[PDB]
Amino acid sequence: MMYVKLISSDGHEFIVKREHALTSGTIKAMLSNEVNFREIPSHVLSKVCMYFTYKVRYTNSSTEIPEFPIAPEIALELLMAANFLDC
Amino acid sequence: MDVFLMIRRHKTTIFTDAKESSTVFELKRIVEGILKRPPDEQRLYKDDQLLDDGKTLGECGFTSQTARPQAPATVGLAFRADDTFEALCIEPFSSPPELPDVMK
Amino acid sequence: VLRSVNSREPSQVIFCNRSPRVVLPVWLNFDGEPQPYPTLPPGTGRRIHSYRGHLWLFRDAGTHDGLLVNQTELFVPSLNVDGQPIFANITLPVYTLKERCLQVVRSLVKPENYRRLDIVRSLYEDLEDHPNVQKDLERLT
Numbered sequence: 001m002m003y004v005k006l007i008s009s010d011g012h013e014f015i016v017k018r019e020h021a022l023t024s025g026t027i028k029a030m031l032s033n034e035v036n037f038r039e040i041p042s043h044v045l046s047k048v049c050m051y052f053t054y055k056v057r058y059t060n061s062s063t064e065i066p067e068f069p070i071a072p073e074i075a076l077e078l079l080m081a082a083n084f085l086d087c
Numbered sequence: 088m089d090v091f092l093m094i095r096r097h098k099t100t101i102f103t104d105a106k107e108s109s110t111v112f113e114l115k116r117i118v119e120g121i122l123k124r125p126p127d128e129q130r131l132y133k134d135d136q137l138l139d140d141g142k143t144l145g146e147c148g149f150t151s152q153t154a155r156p157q158a159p160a161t162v163g164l165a166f167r168a169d170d171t172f173e174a175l176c177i178e179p180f181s182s183p184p185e186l187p188d189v190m191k
Numbered sequence: 192v193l194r195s196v197n198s199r200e201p202s203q204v205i206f207c208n209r210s211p212r213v214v215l216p217v218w219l220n221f222d223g224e225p226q227p228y229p230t231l232p233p234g235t236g237r238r239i240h241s242y243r244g245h246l247w248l249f250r251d252a253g254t255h256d257g258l259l260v261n262q263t264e265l266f267v268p269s270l271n272v273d274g275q276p277i278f279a280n281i282t283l284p285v286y287t288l289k290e291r292c293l294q295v296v297r298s299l300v301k302p303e304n305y306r307r308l309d310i311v312r313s314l315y316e317d318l319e320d321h322p323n324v325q326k327d328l329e330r331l332t
C-alpha cells in the first residue's frame with residue numbers, strides 16, 4: 001500500500017493512500033512523495049483528507065449516503081482550497 | 088465492518104482504515120510499514136488509555152458507526168527512544184479565524 | 192425534446208426520500224415545462240399515481256440543489272408487474288467538495304453580500320450561479 005505526505009502551511013504532516021490523494025488533479029500533477037502547501041492551514045487540510053476517504057467509500061454505492069459536514073468557521077477557507085485542488 | 092482512523096503523534100497524522108475485528112498489534116504493523124518503527128517501540132492510546140496488543144479495535148471502542156470516513160476516530164501514538172517511552176503528545180490543529188460580518 | 196408522453200396508462204409509484212433534505216418532486220409536462228408537486232420531509236414516503244412514460248426529477252425544495260433517483264438524474268415510471276409499485280429511491284449525490292462548500296456559504300451569506308466576501312471574482316460568479324432546473328434541462332439536451 002503506497003502512501004504520500006501532504007504538508008500544511010503550519011507544518012502538520014498528513015499521511016494518506018496514494019490512490020486517495022489522486023482524487024485531486026492538482027496533487028496528481030505536483031507528484032507526476034511529499035507536497036508542501038504554503039496557503040493551507042492544518043484545520044483545512046485535515047478536512048480535505050477526510051473528504052478523500054468519504055468520496056472513495058461512497059462513490060457509486062447503492063446504500064444511503066450521509067451528508068459531508070462542514071463547520072461555518074472553515075467554509076470560506078475550505079472553498080478556496082477545493083477550488084485550487086479541483087475536488 | 089471497516090473503521091476509519093487518524094493515528095496521531097506530535098505533528099504527524101495518518102489516515103487509514105481497519106477491520107473492527109482486527110487487533111491493536113496489527114494496527115502497529117500498519118504504522119511500522121509507514122513510519123519504519125517496530126511494534127515494540129510503539130504505544131497506542133484511546134484518549135489517555137494505553138491499549139493492549141491482543142484486544143480488538145471494537146473492544147477498545149472503535150466501531151463502524153463512530154469511526155466514520157467523514158469523521159474518523161483518533162488513536163494516540165508514542166515512541167520509545169533507547170530505554171524509555173516519550174510522553175504522549177499531540178499538537179492541535181490551527182485555529183480558524185473569526186467569522187466575517189456577512190456570515191454572522 | 193424532454194417531455195412526458197401522454198400515454199394515459201397508469202403506474203403506481205413510491206417516492207421514498209432517503210436524504211436529509213426536504214424534497215421537491217418536479218413533473219415535466221407535455222410541453223416540457225417543469226411542474227412542482229407537494230414536498231416530502233426527510234425519511235418519508237408517498238404512494239402516488241403517475242403514468243407510464245412520464246418524466247420526473249427531484250430537488251432540494253429550499254436551495255434547488257440536485258438529487259439522484261435510483262442512482263441517476265431522471266425517473267420514468269414503467270409497467271407494474273404483479274400489482275407491485277415501482278420504487279423510486281431519492282438520495283444525496285456525492286457532491287464535489289467545491290459544490291458542497293458553495294452550498295454551506297450560500298446558506299450563511301445573503302446574496303446581496305456575496306461581493307463583500309474576500310475571494311476571486313470567479314467564485315462570486317460560482318456563488319451567484321445557484322442551481323436552477325431550467326439550466327439543467329438545457330444541459331441534459
Ligand SMILES: CC(=O)N[C@H](C(=O)N1C[C@H](O)[C@H](F)[C@H]1C(=O)NCc1ccc(-c2scnc2C)cc1)C(C)(C)C
Binds near residue numbers: 199206239
Ligand atoms: C392522464 C395524465 O397524464 N394525467 C396527469 C396526472 O394525473 N399526473 C401527472 C403525473 O403523472 C402525476 F403523477 C399525475 C398526478 O398529478 N397524480 C396526482 C398526484 C398528486 C400528488 C402527488 C404527490 S407528489 C408528492 N406528494 C404527493 C401527494 C403525486 C401525484 C395530469 C392530470 C397532471 C394531466
